[PDB]
Symmetry: C2
Subunit: 364 residues, 2 copies
């Protein structure tokens, strides 16, 4: 009855978002009469204006695809062509591991904790990264961790390591919208740093996890200049273009959220996050406070005998579906037996009823 598993957005539209919905027929006919490149440009401009990445608009080399996983498969084709193995963040949503493993990319974990202490990032990477590519997810799914806890310096140390040691840096920024307008955490211009450093890089951005667009979405990939041509040709074999109708619609959502400083996104997540925290405080599910207020909540199982598999089974029996941590510790899923993830992009009334039932199950 209560799906708290997939992180996809299932909350309803805000009042101003209902006005976008009412304009869908005009957005359709506009895209029919206009030029594909016009809608690509207007979308990319609106997106990187909201995210405050002006360097990306100056370079104007970003490519659009149906979804972040499709951008990731383009990166996977590049990794295979260049015989690159990947050191990948753990924990991480395991579909990322799976799609790269299904492309036969060799994969080795690096634990998130190597990034907790800014002055240990570089020596820890020198000791632990023994592949020619490093794949990070920032802010991380499921933990909400971000190098932005360190200001600029955390990302600067990662980039310094990769440049010094001739590593390809891949970064999935799908959750970066949840840093925006934060006084201390708002993302700086990452593309300025990536370009200035000369590091080889692939950077993936997303709309699907931010807005309630029913997965009618677009992802963005940007490559360093030295691999841009190869990556462009890989990308064009996947698709010619994203729907200009979808691009037109998404541009309205981006502009709407610039106008309200992402309030309609943030307020829904905050309501459910606080309801989860208050309802489960003192329960066997121990809330793990995230660096960034992302759209998922992460819990440690605090019980002498019960594991995350048990909590998963017990909640499922009563109609509440969460995800056990084995789906995020992809290199040794046994490590995930102490954690559970819950989705927060939900209607607050259904979420609050799910939390009431969850606490009743956990108590029994």
């Amino acid at each position: 009855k209560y799906n708290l598993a997939d992180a996809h957005t299932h909350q309803r539209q805000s009042a101003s978002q209902q006005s976008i919905v009412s304009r869908l027929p005009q957005l359709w006919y506009e895209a029919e009469e206009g030029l594909q490149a016009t809608y690509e440009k207007r979308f990319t401009e609106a997106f990187f204006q909201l995210h405050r990445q002006p360097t990306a608009l100056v370079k104007n080399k970003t490519m659009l695809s149906y979804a972040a996983s499709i951008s990731t498969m383009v990166a996977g084709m590049f990794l295979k062509k260049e015989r690159l193995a990947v050191t990948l963040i753990e924990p991480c949503f395991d579909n990322l591991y799976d799609v790269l493993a299904n492309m036969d990319v060799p994969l080795y974990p690096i634990d998130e904790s190597v990034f907790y202490d800014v002055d240990r990032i570089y020596p820890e990477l020198e000791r632990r990264v023994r592949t020619d590519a490093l794949f990070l997810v920032d802010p991380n799914n499921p933990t909400g961790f971000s190098l932005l806890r360190h200001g600029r310096k955390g990302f600067e140390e990662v980039v310094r390591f990769c440049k010094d040691h001739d590593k390809l840096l891949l970064i999935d920024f799908c959750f970066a919208s949840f840093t925006l307008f934060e006084p201390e955490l708002a993302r700086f211009d990452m593309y300025e740093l990536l370009e200035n450093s000369g590091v080889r890089y692939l950077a993936i951005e997303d709309t699907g996890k931010t807005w309630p667009v029913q997965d009618a979405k677009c992802a963005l990939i940007t490559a360093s200049d030295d691999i841009w041509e190869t990556v462009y040709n890989l990308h064009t074999s996947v698709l010619l273009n994203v729907s200009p109708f979808v691009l037109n619609m998404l541009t309205q959502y981006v502009r709407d959220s610039a106008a309200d400083r992402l309030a309609s996104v943030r307020e829904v997540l905050t309501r459910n996050r606080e309801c989860a925290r208050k309802t489960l405080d003192g329960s066997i599910l121990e809330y793990q406070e995230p660096v960034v207020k992302v759209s998922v909540a992460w819990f440690r199982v605090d019980h002498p005998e019960l594991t995350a598999t048990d909590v998963h089974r017990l909640l499922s029996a009563d109609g509440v579906y969460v995800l056990p941590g084995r789906y995020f510790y992809w290199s040794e899923p046994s490590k995930g037996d102490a954690y559970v993830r819950m989705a927060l992009a939900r209607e607050p009334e259904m979420f609050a009823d799910a939390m009431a039932l969850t606490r009743q199950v956990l108590d029994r």
Copy 2:
């Protein structure tokens, strides 16, 4: 500027399709409140009812993705996991070659002419298919050729060969809509044959080339029972779901075309096909009549010196963009300098103006 290059649909909405566009707000709220599985089921049912493939609905194992190229990349991941080489139809749109080559799938051509004589199909395949997999496109892009010119027997001979000789049979059916309601060519239930034969297969179907949905589309892939679980797991690493809003909208286009027996699609393509045929009769572009009335027209260059590359250069200098045949002879692009492809999925007024200009340029 007259874009007759991309085969994507750019004709406008019919009177009844305008009533779908007008209801996009309602279709949005339906998908928002409803279950994802509902919109998957209703789309798949509408699609295979229109295409008259009842066996596919009985088996109920078809998976949905953003686009036919994404389904193809899932097939490519299977081909790479099994380390199989592919014998691929030639000519064919070279994006299919490109995406499989970019996944390092070994690719060897087989000319379309092996399928022209039904009584020679099996011995020609025995001689020429010396890989473990055979990949066909039927009806073919760019030629409109189809084994359906042989009724059931052409496909039955291909399937007999692949079963007898333990070949994986991959078929791209994206142009199959253009056979529907044809008195002699309408596709039979392909999945009845594929299932009954026990052949190992991957079958890809598409919406994007049929309807004017501005590339807000959905593709379908179906695998034989013996590889279904592997392919399912590969597919789920790519995406969890297609937008239920897009599925709901597409379902309305499918039902609309069931109601008019695809007249609003067929009549536009026929008008432009006839215009091209009449306009270019006797010119250096020699029309190649297709088996199936597909959305592209194919011409042979009839000149002692000029190539398709020359023709493309001359037409584009005056604003008419066609595709040289080099983009379809993927194993030997020079073979394609004898041919040109033109897109027909276009507003007829624009197309007729393009044709008048094309003949004016050619007559010089």
